Amino acid sequence: GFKQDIATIRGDLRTYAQDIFLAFLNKYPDERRYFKNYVGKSDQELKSMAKFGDHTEKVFNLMMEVADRATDCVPLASDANTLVQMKQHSSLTTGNFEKLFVALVEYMRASGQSFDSQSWDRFGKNLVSALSSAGMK
Amino acid sequence: GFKQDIATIRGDLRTYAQDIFLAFLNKYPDERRYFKNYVGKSDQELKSMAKFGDHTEKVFNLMMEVADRATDCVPLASDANTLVQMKQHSSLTTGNFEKLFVALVEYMRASGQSFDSQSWDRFGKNLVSALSSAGMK
Ligand code: HEM
Ligand code: HEM
Ligand SMILES: Oc1ccc(Cl)cc1
Ligand SMILES: Oc1ccc(Cl)cc1
């Protein structure tokens, strides 16, 4: 289930992080406007940019911690508050997060691994509600 | 064949029991709610818990006894009745058992071992029928 999925992702995190974030950017190409120098590039081109791998891994490092600190897929209020207050997130709204989780869930349902995709959908929804509660537009 | 599979499983009952049970919960995550003490725990966390290894083994011990007592993958009526009237199975339906055997067969097919998967599928089918006859919804 959800807890084991965290361990699964953490066991091969860079690969899962890149593949999920790529799924997100390919599903929602206009989301590249938040990220400098990602436009006009194929997956393989992105994966060879030093910053892409480093940054995507850090995002998923933190996502796994938030998920791991959750109870029944409900994140901590302080984790939501940190995500809202991060300067790197100043121009984001809940819809950015919703779209990332739609892509994440769709990646999980399509993959060879027995992810508990329904729990990640719940977690995504609960995170969006928490971000809203913490003051994200 | 089926008889050898019973010997194989019995030979390392702890491991196979835990492996197949987890394959079951992974394929059908909603089933975890029947085991409230296993909720929100990783696979390694679960294996450190006394009752997880002990109770899952006891489940598969009885499964093997039922399997061994069967003729041509047809279990005894008395064994089916034991399963229906166990207090722990009061809120269960044949669908719970179907799912366990679907996962068990999938596990067998995906393992590198020459399990008689078709026989376990048939055993599962015959047991589900027997449970129904014994009054399980
Ligand atoms: C649970 C979901 C998310 C987590 C845990 C998270 C976490 C992080 C972390 C840890 C960083 C720092 C990375 C670094 O400096 O190397 C970062 C940066 C950033 N994030 Fe988020 N993030 C999430 C969702 C999103 C979403 C949905 C977007 C927009 C679609 C976004 C946009 C950005 C941007 C623009 C930066 C700075 C530029 C960059 O790293 O390329 N984040 N995020
Ligand atoms: C042929 C298949 C099955 C056999 C032989 C079997 C046998 C057993 C046995 C021997 C126990 C007692 C374990 C102990 O406490 O020492 C048990 C308990 C229990 N079983 Fe079943 N079972 C089967 C299928 C299922 C299924 C499909 C479910 C639900 C999805 C289920 C749910 C439970 C629950 C909730 C308990 C009590 C929890 C616990 O033991 O900690 N069983 N079963
Ligand atoms: O640098 C990155 C990489 C992935 C995400 Cl979701 C956000 C920022
Ligand atoms: O504790 C347990 C473990 C597995 C099963 Cl089927 C029932 C109870």
TrEMBL record, chains A, B:
Task: State where heme b 11 binds.
Answer: 55, 88-89
Provide the binding site for heme b 9. 51, 89
Q: What positions does the entry give for heme b 1 binding?
A: 38, 55, 89
SUPFAM superfamilies in the cross-refs: Globin-like
Residue positions binding heme b 15:
89
| Sites where the protein binds heme b 6 | 89
Q: Which residues bind heme b 2?
A: 89
Q: Where is the Globin domain?
A: 1-136
- Specify which residues bind heme b 7 according to the UniProt entry for this protein: 36, 55, 89
Q: Which positions are annotated as binding heme b 16?
A: 89, 97
Keywords, ordered alphabetically: Heme, Iron, Metal-binding, Oxidoreductase, Oxygen transport, Peroxidase, Transport
**So where does heme b 3 get bound?**
36, 89
Q: Where does heme b 4 bind?
A: 89
The organism named in the record is: Amphitrite ornata
Q: Which family does it belong to?
A: Belongs to the globin family.
Detail which positions bind heme b 12.
Answer: 55, 89
Residue positions binding heme b 8? 38, 89
Name this polypeptide is given: Dehaloperoxidase A
Positions bound to heme b 13: 58, 89
Binding residues annotated for heme b 14, in chain numbering = 88-89
**Which positions does UniProt annotate for heme b 10 binding?**
55, 89
- The answer to keyword Transport applying to this record is yes
Residues holding heme b 5: 88-89
Any idea which GO molecular function terms this record carries? heme binding; metal ion binding; oxygen binding; oxygen carrier activity; peroxidase activity
Transmembrane stretches in the record are none
